[PDB]
């Protein structure tokens, strides 16, 4: 007996907490992980 | 490269001398890459719902 | 000396009697 609505709000409440974990996380991890590649094979010294 | 033209006079004498032959060099060729999108957005949401 | 004073008025009663809830737009709208 599961409501559309209820399914609409938790989609929406989803997104926004998807949108914010994703640019916390970017800047928190994964702009230290691409460098830290870049630097295994010594590709990011130009 | 490429091979030279075929020869239909090949009849030398024995005993004779080496005759120097046709060498060719080998052509070369190169070439160069090329180089972007636009991404124009408002941006100014998508921090909220 | 190791600190700093700072007045910090931070009353805020407002803020913490109203709560607060996540949206997924820049316009919401309720109808009533």
Excluded: C
């Excluded at chain 1, 609409?8 to 996380?25: K, P, S």
């Excluded at chain 2, 090949?10 to 080998?26: I, Y």
């Amino acid at each position: 007996k599961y409501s559309e609505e209820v399914l609409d709000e938790l989609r929406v409440d989803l997104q926004r907490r998807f949108n914010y974990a994703q640019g916390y996380v970017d800047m928190a991890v994964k702009g230290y992980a691409r460098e830290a590649w870049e630097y295994f094979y010594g590709n990011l010294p130009a | 490269d490429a091979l030279a033209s075929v020869d239909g006079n090949n009849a030398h004498v024995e005993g004779s001398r080496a005759e120097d032959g046709e060498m060719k060099p080998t052509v070369i060729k190169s070439n160069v890459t090329q180089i972007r999108k636009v991404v124009r957005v408002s941006d100014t949401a998508n921090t909220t719902a | 000396a190791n600190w700093i004073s700072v007045l910090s008025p931070q009353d805020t009663p407002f803020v913490s009697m109203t709560g607060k809830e996540s949206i997924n737009q820049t316009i919401f709208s309720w109808q009533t």
